[PDB]
Design a binder for this molecule. Structure first.
Ligand SMILES: [Fe+3]
Ligand SMILES: [Fe+3]
Ligand SMILES: [Fe+3]
Ligand SMILES: [Fe+3]
Lengths: 200, 238, 200, 238, 200, 238, 200
């Protein structure tokens, strides 16, 4: 068969992942421009939400050194690739869980509907990439919202998961923190209630 | 009009199949007994037709849709892609690549094919594609099946697609056949064995391309064609 | 020595060559635009001629499945490479012999004079390429005209053929088909009166 | 009634594929975490059904005619023949061999197959044959095509025919898959790679049989099945 | 040591196992004679029972594509190997679970007592073979009855299982389906309450 | 009468010597220029004569006694034994094996043999044997000597015995030659070199059989003959 | 692929082929029972014919050392395989050309019609095998009769030969020798008018 150049192998982000990718969370001084957890500025269009969650290992214990990267569309269902800190909205962001803050946070807007390759509309989602020590190659997952039940049942990606019980793990539960709209998304890497991870 | 500014690398007639190859029976009465007369290259040989202005239909390269009588062909959906380059490695752009084949069963849509395998009412077996700026071509078709023929008592042609490539000149014009990777019928075919060097038979074998395959849809095969090298004229007529 | 990438080996056109290069002759439906035997349209400049011939094998039997490709200059001695079906003249064309029509026909104009690399004029000729089952690598030949005796005697290509009796095989005899000027060119692949084939 | 007079050679569970083979995704949730309990052979294990009296239809082994809706299937007509012997080389006569497959395009005649390749209106894909006195079986069918499946993002099953062989007992019962010679998709399939030893993968590859092919009609493939060795009981209960 | 010819390796039955071994269940037309779930005809000797069960994977989800083969003795404790559809009893039969019927059913009589190689009587049992996608080599197991407590405690095969809690998995609970005597046998392939699988 | 129930494995004409082999001078004018026409096997080709009812003389296989003019021949007394099987390894019973050779000096009992080596008044050179139930044949003769021939200026044929085997059909009928182990003239002979493959020449070399030799009497040579594989007809005319 | 035992290679019958297969023609004493040119005894059913012919090489010169074997059906179109010299008719025979008799002869009856594998009737024919020095592997041919023109045009074997001119070589011309019905069949191994040889 036809053999291409092999891809560079993945390695764990390591315990000190924060020094290079999450400077503030590492307790080290920051640079002028940093890629962080504020995707939307207070003046951006769409429903403003706060996202939080915890990451659990196979023994039900907290992962206090995880690093997450998010990729989502805007309120109109468009991906803003040109990253700039002066923009009202950026599609990319970065968050993490520290020993002080065993919970990660993300300030953004609720994403609009985007279509797949075949033209079938997918439910409002947030693409997540999980990195940490002990994770050799990053884990890919999606975050869905509970108040979007109608769209969730019609999603071509969510319906690709054979068992309905496993589809519930990708769904974030709506709560309210200080009068602000919030959704909680806990990730269970291994064991009971194990979150669905993707390959693409 | 076209000009005489190019020279083509002389064909290696020991690499290519010989005219007289006895095991391929029909080549006995259809091969010259006299030697080919060697002539220098002139404007007649170094020029050739350009097909950039030919009116190609939308599905001319898509054998899954160019015949169509209310359906899809039965067989292994495959993409046949590759590049057309010369002996120097230089890409050959805006060139005509034409192809023809049998159906999944080994039956051609011709009156002379009396083979018992049925015709597919949704398959014709003809395709044409003009290469892009980098020399790339692509076809979408079904994988042809082997077929028997009256040569030896039990001779079977391997799965193949015939190819016709024009190139910059009539000197570069070529008609060949593509064979599929790992087909056990390849070392047994007299038409294949007409080529003496086994390294030459390898150039005709299309390799499975998983990287170019469309997931959950169709597989792909890579076939690169190498035509005669084109060089500029130097120190001619002193 | 210096080795370049090897040229893709040739293989026979096969018996079913017609389904891909001569659709009408294969009894199959044609596409909007096809490359066939009409090089010149009625309003094209030059002396309009009709070419016809038969192909013979080594036992003197007809080759009813041969495919021929022609390349010739116009009446002014110029090669029109830009193939278009709207042109009054096209330098390229294809023809074939079928079981129904064991004779090929070609509608064109008599070509003008073109010079070789050395600046020496060649006699009015038509470059032909023969393909068929049993022919592993196509055969190259030239069609010269009998009423161009003066030019044929001076041609630098025709004089490269040592024996004069072999030069006669490349010469087409003038005849008349329906009051129209015609030239007959029979190709003998093997045997007595074998046609001269070229290598370049 | 049947009697306890035979003993079967113990299965080599390192030759056969393991229960847990991660690359074949569905095997993660469907494989025992606990070890298999080893039990001695009794009349329950050493006996099995005999199918000599089953009413076989005329075309039960001929997949080219057993479905038929006024026609012949599109695809490469092939004969799948072979012998069923035990580990001692002793032939296994009057045994049931059952087989199933996809069409030339890779589409099965099942409601759960949602693959875009069309169904052949003249092909079912089921066959059964009772072996003769020397252990020989034979089928006539069309060569199946590869098909994609939801495992990895670009996983493709090679061309195969599933096989079911009964044998003298329930201890000899086996379900396996036949693969075709030279198919480049074989070393890439996770189901094939579930078998660790490459010499074991070789036993599953059916070889092209030109000697058994019908000239101008159909090709043939040879596939020999080896079942557990049957020996007589000795020195039991002293 | 002495090496014999290697046994042909096993491969999974696959998802489409039904088209070749369970034609009716595949929604395809059947042949004149089929091997299915009716082992005993209404006029057969012995206590007529109905067997039914479900198959579970490691996540406690149903295996809706499993294929099962059964081998059992008659009421008098004899194995009827000569399969014929005219017989009042057949010792062999096949059943399956579909997406429509995620539960298999089998119509038979309660088997009699058969002795082992050593002459020791085994408790009334039904030999089962499980095939499905994801199962590379079929799983062997036995179905024992709960109302045969005395015989189950004496069985030489059942006593080869070290732990008593594991023996309980091979025991079918007596229930009633439409006033008919029935026994439920659920198979847990993996996890908590995993069914004992055999090797012989 | 005979019936059409058998099919024979197609001959490998690249294994057998070619018609045109220039070094063997007489083959130049006695070889076809045209290709052989391939025809399917019918009752004419699949049937053949059975010589079980032919009246063999008691000494027809014994060349030491079948000529006899009051004495024994001069030369190395040998037994030429072997078995006649087909390509499947199946024995060929009750078949006709005919053989002829020259004397110890390379002289044949024929009018055209003008070679200066004298004739042996007690040796003819003809033999015929009908194979038994297991396909075995046996001949008792003297080892023939080499002889020169008008081909090249110094050409010598090795020591050989010509053989003619009938087989179950005219499709299996074969005429060949047996050569002796270690003869240095074998790689030099143009008739032997008519065979392109050196493994094919090995099949014609009779090996010394000390086990079958008669102590204080005669030596023995083993020569097994392999005829075309016979198989039953299957899936013909549907 | 599957490889069987290779067939024993063929070798030329040699110049002295007669000593072992044609004893009388070799001028050597015969045995009690010999296989020769009298297939039919004067009392056998069917039209009694005499067959003669000569064998020519590529230079038009006679082959005076050829050995031929024939196989034909009886007047009813049946093959008599059990060879016995007491039979009125035998399907097998042997003839040869000597330096004295450069012409071969065969006394037999005209064969009846036999069908092919597909059930299509073949024209009356005689299967011939030609052996000689210079012929490495024997040549297979068929003899057809000229007074059977209707059947000859409908023969599935004779129509397999592409060119009609080559079909005429397998046809024997009817003549009369001493008031006896005779057919002449000349075989031209090489060159002009070369006889069609078969492979099966
Ligand atoms: Fe580190
Ligand atoms: Fe072809
Ligand atoms: Fe499958
Ligand atoms: Fe000799």
């Amino acid at each position: 068969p036809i053999e291409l150049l092999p891809e560079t192998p993945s390695q764990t982000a390591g315990p000190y992942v924060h020094i290079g990718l999450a400077l503030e969370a590492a307790g080290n001084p920051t640079r002028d421009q940093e890629i962080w957890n504020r995707l939307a500025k207070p003046d951006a269009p769409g429903e403003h939400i706060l996202l939080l969650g915890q990451v659990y290992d196979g023994n039900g214990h907290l992962v206090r050194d995880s690093f997450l990267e998010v990729w989502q569309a805007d309120a109109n269902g468009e991906y803003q690739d040109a990253y700039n800190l002066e923009n009202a909205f950026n599609s990319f962001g970065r968050t993490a869980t520290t020993f002080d803050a065993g919970e990660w946070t993300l300030h953004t807007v609720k994403p609009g509907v985007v279509n797949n390759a075949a033209g079938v509309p997918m439910a409002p989602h947030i693409n997540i990439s999980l990195f940490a020590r002990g994770i050799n190659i990053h884990l890919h997952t999606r975050l869905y919202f509970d108040d979007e039940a109608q769209a969730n049942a019609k999603c071509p990606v969510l319906n690709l998961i054979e068992q309905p019980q496993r589809r519930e793990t990708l769904i974030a539960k709506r709560c309210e923190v200080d009068g602000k709209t919030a959704y909680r998304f806990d990730i269970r890497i291994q064991g009971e209630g194990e979150t669905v991870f993707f390959d693409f | 009009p076209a000009q005489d500014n190019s020279r083509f690398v002389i064909r290696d007639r020991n690499w290519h199949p010989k005219a007289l190859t006895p095991d391929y029976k029909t080549s006995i009465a259809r091969s010259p007994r006299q030697a080919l007369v060697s002539i220098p290259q002139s404007i007649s040989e170094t020029t050739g037709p350009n097909f950039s202005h030919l009116g190609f239909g939308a599905h001319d390269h898509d054998l899954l849709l160019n015949f169509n009588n209310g359906g899809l062909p039965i067989g292994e959906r495959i993409i046949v892609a590759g590049r057309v380059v010369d002996q120097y490695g230089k890409p050959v752009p805006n060139t005509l690549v034409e192809m023809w084949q049998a159906n999944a069963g080994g039956r051609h849509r011709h009156k002379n094919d009396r083979y018992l395998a049925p015709l597919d009412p949704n398959f014709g077996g003809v395709g044409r594609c003009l290469t892009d700026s980098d020399g790339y071509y692509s076809f979408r078709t079904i994988k042809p099946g082997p077929y028997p023929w009256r040569n030896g008592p039990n001779d079977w042609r391997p799965a193949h697609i015939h190819f016709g490539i024009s190139g910059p000149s009539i000197a570069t014009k070529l008609i060949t056949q593509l064979y599929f990777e790992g087909d056990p019928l390849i070392p047994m075919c007299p038409i294949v064995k007409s080529i003496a060097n086994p390294e030459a038979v390898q150039q005709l074998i299309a390799k499975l391309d998983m990287n170019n395959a469309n997931p959950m849809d169709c597989l792909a095969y890579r076939f690169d064609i190498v035509l005669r090298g084109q060089r500029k004229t130097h120190f001619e007529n002193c």
